[PDB]
């Protein structure tokens, strides 16, 4: 059974219980902490590809209100994110399945960008999102898979101190 488990658990807790937060630019910025992957259960010799999008967890846009996150009452469907592709992609399943996938090199923009970089709404909270796809073999696959524990707001500053320090205190 092909297995997806989210690296430093722990880490990202700490993040989830105060609401976390990840800063967007013009120019892209990359994410603290970044999403590694414990992937087991792949063919060896089989040839994947590692894909990241980010779900808007719901439609509204968010506020930090005296000290706390509150959703606006105004919804609007969220168009879903671009794909980005783990640099080291195709590969084959002992290349997945030797070391976490680390996602370090993913640049979260708000504005539409060349390339590489994905585009969030500032003030959206976003569930980070992997798919593997099975390539060149006859019988393409793909298995997904969600991690809530790294759910976020992306944000062009920091509202919550407490989270500008966890960033500070663990990178
Ligand atoms: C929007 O389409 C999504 C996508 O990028 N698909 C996709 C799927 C599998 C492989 C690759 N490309 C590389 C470089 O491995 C791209």
New binding site residues.
């Given amino acids: 059974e092909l297995r997806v488990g989210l690296e430093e658990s722990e880490l990202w807790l700490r993040f989830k219980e105060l609401t976390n937060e990840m800063i967007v630019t013009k120019n892209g910025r990359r994410m603290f902490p970044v999403l590694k992957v414990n992937v087991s259960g792949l063919d060896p010799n089989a040839m994947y590809?590692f894909?990241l999008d980010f779900v808007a967890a719901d439609n509204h846009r968010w506020k930090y209100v005296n000290g706390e996150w509150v959703p606006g009452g105004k919804p609007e469907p969220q168009a879903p994110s671009?794909?980005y592709?783990?640099p080291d992609?195709?590969n084959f399943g002992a290349h997945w399945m030797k070391a976490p996938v680390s996602f370090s090199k993913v640049k979260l923009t708000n504005k539409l960008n060349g390339g590489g970089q994905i585009m969030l709404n500032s003030l959206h909270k976003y569930e980070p999102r992997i798919?593997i796809?099975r390539?060149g073999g006859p019988q393409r696959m793909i298995t997904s898979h969600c991690f809530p524990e790294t759910q976020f707001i992306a944000v062009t500053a920091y509202q919550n101190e407490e989270i500008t320090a966890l960033k500070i205190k663990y990178n």
């Fill in positions: 590809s894909l671009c794909v592709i783990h992609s195709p798919h796809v390539v």
